[PDB]
């Protein structure tokens, strides 16, 4: 699977490592949420990441299915 990642500069799409067949999006507010919106982490995973309180995590299983909001139709 190819997933979007926020770990690169510029943000980019990457082929996920072996055994990581999901893309994920994890989002939470920081103190600038009211202006910059939520912080978003995008990447690859074997199992859909666990979420702490006030975090949102959603996974998907098709190529490039987890775009950053500013790179999403």
């Amino acid at each position: 699977i190819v997933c979007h990642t926020t770990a690169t500069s510029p943000i980019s799409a990457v082929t996920c490592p072996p055994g990581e067949n999901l893309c994920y999006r994890k989002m939470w507010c920081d103190a600038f949420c009211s202006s910059r919106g939520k912080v978003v982490e995008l990447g690859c995973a074997a199992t859909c990441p666990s979420k702490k309180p006030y975090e949102e995590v959603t996974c998907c299983s098709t190529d490039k299915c987890n775009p950053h909001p500013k790179q999403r139709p």
Epitope: I11, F32, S35, R36, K38, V39, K70
Partner: antibody, heavy 131, light 115 residues
Framework: QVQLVQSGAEVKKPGSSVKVSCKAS????????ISWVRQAPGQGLEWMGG????????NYAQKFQGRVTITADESTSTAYMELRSLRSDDTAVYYC????????????????????????WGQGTLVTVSS | ASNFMLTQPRSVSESPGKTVTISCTRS????????VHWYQQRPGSSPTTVIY?????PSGVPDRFSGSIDSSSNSASLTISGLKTEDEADYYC???????????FGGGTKLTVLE
């Protein structure tokens, strides 16, 4: 203590274009946005737009949409403002300026554009357009 | 389609050692819905920040400079106490219009120190 260093003053004929550059010290734009702000003679500051290289996206003020192009090359740590179809109202000092609040850290990034305060400013570039 | 306006007085004048206040009134929408920052610009120089995020002072900026917000007048204010001749400069407020996704600058205030 990043600095932004801009190209020099230019004098231009009407209808021509100018491309002003803005070189960041330190070899990178990181996750920062760079805006272009201009100041016509004796007048106030006016935002033209900005660019966020880490997202590959630019934002424009409606007043300049389609006539200005703002770009940046991370590999040469240089940002640019190309303003086309120059007219007398474009005589101004043009500044580049860094948004103090980066868009990314620790492998995650903010979701929305929001231009915060401008901490580091270039020295300005005068562009004078004849009548 | 028009951005909101930030309106400042064109000129403010005062003697050294006095306190001066420069206001920045938002024409539409609430002043508290978006941060206000303030820049100083001396002649022939680039702007520098004196107040950001309504009332925060960058390192290096003297404590004589402060910022505040007044919801009832829908305004932000830059206050300079113990005015010094070196404070003569143009001052600009700045905020952001979320509807149009644009930075908004006030029109600028020229501060003159009376002799």
């Amino acid at each position: 203590q990043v600095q932004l260093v801009q190209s020099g003053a230019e004098v231009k004929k009407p209808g021509s274009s100018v491309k002003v550059s803005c070189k960041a010290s330190g070899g990178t734009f990181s996750s920062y946005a760079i805006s272009w702000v201009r100041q016509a003679p004796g007048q106030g500051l006016e935002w033209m737009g900005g660019i966020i290289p880490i997202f590959g996206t630019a934002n424009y003020a409606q007043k300049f949409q389609g006539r200005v192009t703002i770009t940046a090359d991370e590999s040469t740590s240089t940002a640019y403002m190309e303003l086309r179809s120059l007219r007398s109202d474009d005589t101004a000092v043009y500044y580049c300026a860094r948004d103090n609040l980066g868009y990314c850290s620790g492998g995650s990034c903010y979701s929305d554009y929001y231009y915060y305060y401008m901490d580091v400013w270039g020295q300005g570039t005068l562009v004078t357009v004849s009548s | 389609a028009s951005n909101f306006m930030l309106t400042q007085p064109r000129s403010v004048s005062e003697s050294p050692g006095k306190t001066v206040t420069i206001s920045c009134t938002r024409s539409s929408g609430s002043i508290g819905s978006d941060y206000v920052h303030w820049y100083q610009q001396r002649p022939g120089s680039s702007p520098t920040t004196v107040i950001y995020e309504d009332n925060q002072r960058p390192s290096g900026v003297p404590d004589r400079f402060s910022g505040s917000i007044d919801s009832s007048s829908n305004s932000a204010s830059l206050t300079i106490s113990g005015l010094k001749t070196e404070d003569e400069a143009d001052y600009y407020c700045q905020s952001y219009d979320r509807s149009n996704h644009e930075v908004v600058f006030g029109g600028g205030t020229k501060l003159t120190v009376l002799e």
